[PDB]
Symmetry: C4
């Protein structure tokens, strides 16, 4: 896709939704009300490579849980917003602070609360399992599903657009 590659070039900030994007969208509940969530190892590797390439990252979530706080910290995610349903307001405040334009922002989502952002940013993507209305209004859909490498693919699409994937791969393959 000419359009996605081109949209990838200007990205300085990559924002992820949590449930449905970093997870497969399942909520595990125990009888006491505590939760379990699941993330994916390909995704963690993708996010680390993206950050190492100079792209900053953020998560904006309508829910709130220490599990997400821990995961974000482990991956080096620099900006974490939880318990925020108004995602565009949150983003606008982040961008005012970092002084970036919408065209410098990539966002990966799965559902309606992600849509006001997806519609505005430079690289607004849906995961394959995303609500179809969100799919139809995004710039691109990942092939992989959330919690199954969608976030990794998003990461690689950006690294590739910016000419940085090859360098990332050379760390692990001696021929390049």
């Amino acid at each position: 896709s000419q359009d996605l590659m081109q949209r990838g070039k200007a990205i300085k900030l990559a924002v992820f939704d949590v449930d449905g994007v970093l997870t497969d969208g399942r909520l595990y509940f125990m009888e006491d009300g505590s939760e379990i969530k699941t993330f994916n190892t390909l995704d963690g590797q993708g996010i680390k490579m993206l950050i190492a390439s100079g792209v900053t990252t953020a998560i904006i979530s309508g829910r709130k849980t220490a599990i997400v706080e821990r995961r974000a910290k482990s991956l080096g995610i620099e900006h974490l917003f939880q318990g925020r349903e108004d995602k565009l307001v949150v983003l606008d405040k982040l961008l005012a602070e970092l002084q970036l334009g919408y065209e410098q922002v990539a966002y990966l989502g799965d559902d309606l609360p992600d849509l006001p952002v997806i519609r505005r940013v430079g690289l607004g993507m849906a995961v394959a399992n995303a609500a179809s209305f969100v799919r139809e209004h995004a710039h691109g859909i990942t092939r992989a599903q959330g919690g199954e490498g969608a976030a990794r693919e998003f990461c690689e699409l950006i690294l590739s657009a910016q000419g940085n994937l090859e360098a990332a791969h050379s760390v692990y393959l001696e021929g390049h």
Copy 2:
């Protein structure tokens, strides 16, 4: 016709296991349970409620997990440990002064079938038992616990011309 059946709906009822969940039962060594729901499903149920359709759950099982989940979503009527689902329904229909033709029901297995057979919009999830699928008016594309409920909700919103308005909150 499915859209026609959807128009008249005033009450949408869900089974739990196999419909709000994927049918899996998780047990720890001491017998406590874990259960999985889906976020697409929650957004769908919240949008149906907002549209003015009331919702209920009827389950043969019983767990605090489901009470919490029902409350978090604003589900107005919850019946658990009830194997006789049509008797539960009849009672609720009395309280609400509704007939069968105004009830949608989303089910996955034999105990849901007496209801599915009788209501205005009786649907099975994709993973439902084949015999239930055969006797339902419709079958969702999505599987239970993987957005079959969100799909059921939108079907009803769409049928009632309320889906565009629910989307408009996010396109402004």
Copy 3:
């Protein structure tokens, strides 16, 4: 022919992991397990029991989780931590006074094979090791943990003409 092999069945025997579950083992840090079962399977086992076929589980692993699940389902005979499945079965058969031809067994791996090869209806689930699939009388279309046990129960009920009645309950 499978329908023919189903007729004489008086005892139905299940492996646990990969048959009543998807083959996944969940472990927590402290070392304790979580196991997952499926609601279609439970409904299927209850109907088969109600038709007058008795049920058993033979497993090489051992956990209180499986004991509780067996009890909840009304599974009559439970053997865990058993390496030689054929030895265990021979003894149960002597005690119940049945021949191999009256036994159905559903398994997923090598330890199940000596039984599967000897009984009247020796079946593998879809996700079974291919060597076991190749030496079974039949293979369920569904995967373990995902309704393969249900499917196996319905094959017996159907072979014995009892499925139609089991369904009728839900058509009234």
Copy 4:
């Protein structure tokens, strides 16, 4: 035949954990503790491999007692966790066992496995491996990690070494 040929000389079979022995999911509870899932087909395959005289190892960049217990339950003789440089660890282990790269098989799913995968005699990826790894491995299993890929890999080695029949024989009497 190429894979069959590489399998002949194997004396050590090494596995990544996440994405190879598991489907790659990481389960976290509120208090930080984890759950991990393994697969019973995989356990049988690994036990059969060991029984044939091929030793086994695990090299992971993560660290959890769950893996320690799983490896001990399966009889996996060598375990290294928290190890970012997988080759460095393999080299240390090979000198101890006095084995060479050509006698090693490795089953991986992501970039940190690729340098080992490129060095060894039988360097395989699972079906769900990052595609760049799949492209550079000697071979790819049909099965996905956590769903029998390890079993399929074990059986490849067993068969290559004329040992699968004997493994199956126990169950044909």
